[PDB]
Amino acid sequence: RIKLLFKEKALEILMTIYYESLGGNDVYIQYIASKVNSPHSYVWLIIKKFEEAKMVECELEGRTKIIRLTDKGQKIAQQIKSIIDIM
């Protein structure tokens, strides 16, 4: 039913960032990869699309890519959470 309406891979990435940040973790690209069913390169591509859409920001801490939701990204994730709940 989720696949009905959503691009499942992009959704899983977004909600992973949401829940990880909500719990108080810095969100690392490596961690998102451990949680979703996508190769590192695909996660990277989707993150760049989210960044383009102004939903996330990226920064490098040494060799470590950290991803944070913008206010826009957060709002969207919260609304998707309610849809998933309703579904």
Swiss-Prot record:
Q: List the disulfide bonds.
A: none
Q: List residues traversing the bilayer.
A: none
Classification via InterPro entries:
WH-like_DNA-bd_sf (IPR036388), WH_DNA-bd_sf (IPR036390)
Indicate what this protein is called per its UniProt record: Uncharacterized protein AF_1382
